[PDB]
Design goal:
Chain A: Residues 1-250 are annotated as: Interaction with LPXN. Chain A: The record marks 52 as: Interaction with coactivator LXXL and FXXFY motifs. Chain A: It is found in: Nucleus; Cytoplasm. The complex is a heterodimer. Chain A has ten helices and four strands, in the order αααββαααβααααβ. Chain A is mostly helical. Chain A has one domain: Retinoid X Receptor (Orthogonal Bundle), CATH 1.10.565. In chain A, strand 1 and strand 2 (100-102) form a beta hairpin. In chain A, helix 3 (62-88) crosses helix 5 (113-128), helix 3 (62-88) packs antiparallel against helix 6 (133-143) and helix 3 crosses helix 8. The radius of gyration of chain A is 18 Å and the shape is globular. Chain B has one helix at 2-5. Chain B is built from one helix and no strands. Chain B is elongated and about 10 Å long. By secondary structure, chain B is mainly alpha-helical. The chains are: A mainly alpha, B mainly alpha. The structure holds 5-alpha-dihydrotestosterone. Residues 33, 36-37, 39-40, 43, 74, 77-78, 81, 96, 205, 208-209, 212 of chain A line the site of 5-alpha-dihydrotestosterone.
Chain lengths: 250, 8
């Protein structure tokens, strides 16, 4: 047969994205956070292009297409970063970009060490669970449809249909080589648990970037155009409970 | 905005 769905995810997977960080300069909270913010701006461009190219994505109302991306970019970017860390330096450090690799010192200079530890842990989960490149791809796609407003989307039905189909695909990726039920059942359990763990991490980073935006001018931290807008219009909706993640387990 | 221009 032909792995049509997987052929697609693989084909549309974004390439390498650098942050343009000056590693020849001593680490500073301002320089580091400003470099992460610009990396977010650059990655967002690739996330938009990636999403628009996902199977069925254009079925969503245009307003919803923008909404899911605006709400999920953090989890998506954190997830992809954890995988990069796992496969490049084996989770030893957080591989944000080839030119922005965090060691313990940078994790501390960034003033978000605790959040970094969790991201490093998630990164290790990729190794502990032996996540395959294909499971990573489908799990990441599912993360784009994992957070919605409690009041529902413009066209909620189309979204529900899309999310269901991506869960179905994740389910068949699990039953490719496995020919045992308790086996597939166990794997699905582990992955959904893994997907859920991304949410608390994104929440912390959402709170952290929000507070940073509010007083960025006082700490010399620069927020690019799209980042500043999304963080002050969309992120608050999340922090105030108007928009929530979809958890598999509670 | 620039983000919106991506779908507009
Ligand atoms: C999404 C990014 C940048 C892309 C990536 O690889 C994951 C990483 C997670 C932390 C984010 C960062 C973008 C800029 C943020 C939002 C900072 O303001 C504080 C948290 C940072």
């Amino acid at each position: 047969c032909q792995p049509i769905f997987l052929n697609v995810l693989e084909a549309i997977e974004p390439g390498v994205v650098c942050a343009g960080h000056d590693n020849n300069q001593p680490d500073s909270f301002a320089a580091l956070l400003s470099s992460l913010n610009e990396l977010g701006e650059r990655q967002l461009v690739h996330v938009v292009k990636w999403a628009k190219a996902l199977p069925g994505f254009r079925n969503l109302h245009v307003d919803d297409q923008m909404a899911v991306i605006q709400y999920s970019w953090m989890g998506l970017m954190v997830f992809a970063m954890g995988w990069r860390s796992f496969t490049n330096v084996n989770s030893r450090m957080l591989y944000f970009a080839p030119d922005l690799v965090f060691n313990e010192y940078r994790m501390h200079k960034s003033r978000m060490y605790s959040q970094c530890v969790r991201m490093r842990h998630l990164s290790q989960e990729f190794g502990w669970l032996q996540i395959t490149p294909q499971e990573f791809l489908c799990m990441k796609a599912l993360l784009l449809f994992s957070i919605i407003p409690v009041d529902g989307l413009k066209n909620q039905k189309f979204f529900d249909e899309l999310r269901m189909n991506y869960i179905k695909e994740l389910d068949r990726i699990i039953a490719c080589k496995r020919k045992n039920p308790t086996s597939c059942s166990r794997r699905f359990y582990q992955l959904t648990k893994l997907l859920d763990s991304v949410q608390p991490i994104a929440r912390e980073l959402h709170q952290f970037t929000f507070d940073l935006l509010i007083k960025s001018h006082m700490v010399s931290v620069d927020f690019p155009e799209m980042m500043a807008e999304i963080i002050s219009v969309q992120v608050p909706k999340i922090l105030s409970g108007k928009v929530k993640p979809i958890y598999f387990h509670t | 905005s620039r983000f919106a221009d991506f779908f507009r």
